[PDB]
Symmetry: D2
Subunit: 439 residues, 4 copies
């Protein structure tokens, strides 16, 4: 079942540092296609992680596979940091326009979402001439010294490595589930906007805040969407004070949320800056920061550039990846399957009381499990047990914040495989309730 896989993981742990991996189970993938993973042992699973929302278009999509192998024969690499290639020129043009909004934009290439967010700090700082950056608790923007300082979802991203980047203030992200009693969405929006302002009313000058970076829906936080009114308040606040408005679309973008972009789950908001990564190259190492033209011109070279960034083989794969999304109606597909998945999960909650909250926007959801529906006490054990039952039954799914099931399969997932996956979870809950799982 996992024999060949375990023998190898045990040799990788001698040579590969434990800091670079979050460990759940022994999974040594041989190959995969669409939403199906096959390990070296021959076990087939249904993928509900999509490699951390990096494979919206499914594993080894033939169009993407072909682009890669085609481009590799011509030019594996020549750095855009010095010269020019057709795939990159084409892709920067396309990203500049498909980004939300109608203001002219420019693009800057990276290898990872992390460096894209580092870029955001740069551009924001150089454009405004201000130094302070506001980010959110519960957020995750990367592992580079800039984007890690912004993050607030793991204490291990601060431990033993400080001091971090100076001039960063964190604020709390609106939690609509663990609220005070009798609190409407409007009250939640107003409460969290009060917290948002307190720093600006005490030690943090609004005139010296370069920007505010926010995930329209916090991924690592537990698929938490900020209330519509809250986003508007913060948005208005930024433009009223010269503070750039930046979004992290690294995880929640490219159709994940049932719209091209997660910020498009909101009314008429265009970001000054935004980070795109992961799925852009179907898992290949490509990222980008997109921004209003005037902001992207604020820096002179080489303020922000990487040798391997905007790799032609990777740019080709992103060009195919985007054609796949538009041509297979993946954005629209996600909104639909996300609505059907929500229904089945809301129905599961009528039978399984442990499922405290069902958050879902497109094929993008968080299934928050608790010990009691009225106390909302996190249940890491129920959640932990559910996934293992899933793994042993051909479904790969993980957790966020211990007790929340992370549901983010490839957007191209066939309906047959979704019902097949949604069933195994239905069983997992019963299996857990009837005390049948002991990890």
């Amino acid at each position: 079942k996992l024999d060949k896989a375990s023998k190898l993981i045990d040799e990788e742990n001698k040579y590969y540092a434990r800091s670079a991996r979050i460990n759940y189970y022994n999974l040594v993938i041989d190959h995969a296609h669409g939403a199906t993973l096959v390990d070296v042992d021959g076990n087939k699973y249904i993928d509900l992680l999509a490699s951390a929302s990096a494979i919206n278009v499914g594993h080894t999509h033939e169009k993407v596979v072909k682009a890669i192998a085609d481009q590799a024969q011509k030019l594996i690499h020549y750095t855009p940091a010095y010269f020019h290639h057709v795939p990159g020129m084409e892709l920067s043009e396309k990203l500049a326009k498909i980004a939300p909004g109608n203001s002219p934009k420019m693009v800057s290439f990276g290898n990872s979402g992390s460096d894209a967010n580092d870029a955001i700090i740069k551009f924001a700082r150089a454009y405004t001439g201000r130094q302070y950056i506001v980010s959110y608790m519960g957020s995750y923007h990367g592992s580079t010294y800039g984007s890690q300082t912004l993050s607030g979802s793991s204490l291990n991203m601060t431990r033993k490595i400080g001091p971090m980047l100076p001039s960063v203030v964190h604020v709390p992200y609106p939690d609509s589930y663990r609220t005070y009693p009798g609190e409407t969405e409007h009250d939640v929006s107003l409460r969290y906007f009060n917290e948002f302002k307190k720093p600006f009313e005490s030690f943090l000058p609004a005139d010296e805040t370069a920007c505010v970076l926010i995930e329209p829906i916090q991924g690592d936080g537990g698929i938490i969407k900020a209330p519509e009114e809250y986003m508007q308040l913060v948005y208005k606040f930024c433009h009223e004070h010269g503070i750039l408005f930046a979004i992290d679309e690294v995880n929640q973008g490219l159709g994940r949320t049932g719209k091209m972009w997660a910020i498009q789950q909101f009314k008429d908001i265009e970001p000054d800056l935004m980070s795109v990564g992961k799925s852009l190259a179907s898992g290949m190492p490509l990222s980008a920061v997109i921004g209003k033209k005037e902001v992207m011109q604020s820096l002179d070279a080489p303020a922000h550039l990487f040798t391997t960034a905007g790799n032609p083989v990777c740019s080709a794969a992103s060009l195919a990846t985007l054609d796949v999304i538009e041509y297979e109606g993946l954005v629209e597909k996600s909104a639909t399957d996300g609505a059907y998945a929500k229904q089945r999960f809301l129905e599961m909650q009528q039978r399984h009381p442990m499922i405290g909250d069902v958050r879902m926007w497109g094929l993008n959801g968080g299934i928050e499990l608790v010990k009691d529906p009225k106390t909302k006490e996190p249940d890491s054990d129920a959640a932990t047990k559910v996934i293992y039952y899933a793994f042993a039954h051909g479904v790969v799914i993980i957790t966020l914040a211990g007790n929340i099931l992370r549901f983010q399969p490839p957007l191209v997932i066939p309906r047959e495989q979704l019902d097949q996956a949604l069933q195994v979870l239905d069983d997992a809950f019963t299996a857990v309730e009837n005390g049948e799982v002991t990890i």
Copy 2:
């Protein structure tokens, strides 16, 4: 116009793509390449003396690399090593552990770029030592991420308008063997620079609170300068006697570029606690790695250092094929031989062309420093611009460092006939510039 398409395409790209993301030289829209041969969209062929900033050690589109890229992609394009495992990456992390310089057990951590690798060095060093301070050199380049960019010291536009930078970082002067004082021997240089090295430790920087010294055995972007043997030994000793980790940046000078596997092996008996790799690691595919002594790498918990796409299975395959080409075609030796060849050729050119003030070369990695007057050693950026622009017009691509130093880093697999063409174009370029035939 030889560049009729290239110019038209760049005019559009400059509207959508930030200008800070590229150091502009020539209108070069590459269509395809192989070995040390590049072909633009207009059909013009060039000899590659830049190797995409030493990211193409084994030459463009090597069939083994191309094949590994195509084979691996079909089976699995990606699945993050930050959560799960794939065979190509398990194998590469093992190989990079043993081929790393020194004999101490080592562990590897993958990244995407040279920049994030050095960012990791800071963390691992800080985490292991329990100290916060980091020492790096002026004239260095470690990356474009907030950590590595703070360590760098080669471009004022890497500090400008993005401050404040990362705290607890101190810069020291890197030993310069060309612009020295009258009568200074190598021993004098080593001592003078080691003495500047100490000053901060003798004043405000506690040696006991310094997590590590990061250094380029040969500064690349700094103008291809090699630290004198004795200097490196003084520094290396000082670190050990004080519990400071000794880290090296091998992102540019590594993988057979200097004529050995690692630039550090040009120095006697030195094993680093931490080292950064990238670029040529996967023939230009985005893949880096930090490699350090086992006990250091273990000093951090997850997810202190990971990237979704770092250790990409396609890039891992690419890298294994790359490392195989270096071994099988004996590229390390070839660099040492053709390097030695290039060096003499350039030293002979210097005898006829006094604008060439200094010839620095180790493997097929060289800096040809151009100066107005050999006695004053005053930099001649205008001349070096002329040489390179003449070369471009004559089918040879080559850029500069620090304005006046010609950058010599072609793919290690370059055929002797093409190495000789390029050298002749360069020679011709020098004569052409002397006669005032080249206009910038």
Copy 3:
């Protein structure tokens, strides 16, 4: 009436930086005694400010004046950084014992409360080996880069002078007066302790937090005392995580609150570190950091010291100051006149509904003005009128946060003077209601 006063200030304003003063009145003091001020024109005023709670024992106190004169003849100054003098040895020993708690304590001198709070950062980091400091929004700790970074009461303390000291996190301070509908003190305490945790649950590791600095009662914030329950939750949390618990007694200490130390207004709380300043030497430049011996021995010379710090003249003045507090029973006097003062103001509140909130502990209080009781909207206009009517009727009083009247007279103030001052304040409110005062 302000002739000589105004002519002198015009001449001063060409030479003294405007940032070195917050301007109220053309008040040039020639001399003073007890709670009576006398300007260079002959006008008399009752002091309700006490040089910012720096004159607890009253102006030109016989004991304190004589002490200063006698010491200046024997030795104006010798630095304790290098050599010893008797007045300093007695002071450092005495303070070490009159500090709250019975754990053994050591003392280190400074010149102002600012540098003492800078010391607290040093000693905390040193002892714990941790780098992160947690301070409060709405706090004021000093004008030195360390203490200024910890501060949170004026955006002008951050502007144009950054970057600030790294590894500092700001948490909100419990606000009893402006709460949400139907909140009890218990809800306030739990809410604010809930905000306090968020950072430790996201990006701030408790295990890497050296300390938490807090004012038992925020002075600059507006005489805001934190709920007993809150404090205990914080204090307990600190001990469970190895986080030192620091207090800033610079403003609210030395009997100001009706007990020796503002921290003693809470139950069984001994700080690991405490800053003292202001009134310790009757306004002479002298401060101190007092901590548990094990904490203070964590530093080697000269990590923290000052040339003029622990000055023999300012040490003598302090010894005499502490003698007055003890001999004249000023701690008890403050508790009593404070209890009395509070009831008088509570009584003024019932008759004057522009008094939104009456915060008082000992002879120190904030009298917050509002436009409407239900809204609790700040009424800066009214407050400014009151303080100008006051000055015009021989009473010197300033505001905190624009709308809060700062009631902090010398502890030795005579009941008659106190009553006359209170009566003028009563008249002021009545006058402002009748529309009789415009500046």
Copy 4:
């Protein structure tokens, strides 16, 4: 008998007073003092050569200052200028703004210590220029507050255990004119050190982002080291050309200590943008001030920089008197005259005592650097210790700088008789060390 009472008071103070707040030399428990005379609790007399870190330029307990203190204490012990005004402070701030070097209008701002004055400099420079980076020197001491301590560079214990320190700060070497390279002239020294000064600016530090350069015209803590005239001129010019404010620390070397009113007046026509004053300003009473060109001092709104006790009416009275005494007694001139004499006394000594490697002196303000051998210049801290204890046992109080440098900064009023007494004792000390007659 001699220090028995002092050893019991000190044994008890060590239980309550932190060891970090004092540099321990001797069991000197002072009862009173006047001029350059110190008297312990046992009635022992000592000649003061430390002037309590040069905070007693006008001698201990000057009668005019004492009267100033007592008279004022009776009128008003304190009322903060942060909120209100008092005549003594208004007079002082006016006078400081005029006696400051240069003819450009100035504005003052009061603090309590040299430290907060230096933190203020950072603020003012950053606020005026809009730039963040500050440049200070190694071997410098500017204070114990987090800002000024970060600029400081004279002690490792001022950084240990307390970081991270204030960001955006770079340290540069100070010109050493004693431990030079063989054959170096003042010119050579000046150019070498100016060249080191530029390396950061030529590598990672953007000059257009450097708010200022803070410097001690003569380093006090460093060992009484004066920068060469030419060097200072070059740095001065560099600052003006790039908009970088030029700040000086006059806390230790100001108020007539060097033979001129300001240490910077030892150089030709150099007016600072910002400067810091303290110590002697108020004859030891806690008062400091930052002084700068008006336009610079107007770049902050309140309360960016203020202290409750800062500008205390008694301290200002003390300061006003101390300034009249300097003037009335011609102390500036006396520092130069008696400084020139003391310098010769020490040079005559150096002729018979070759352990005296260097005699640095400017006013009654010197550093007598003691070495093991004149050729090698190896520091002899052992000898220094012995000399200072021998001096202490024979009624002369004096301490060292950097372990091997004797610190010479008595009260400027020192009577010639006492000066010769002390001098003769230090001579006796050298002879005594020579003969191994002194054991610590």
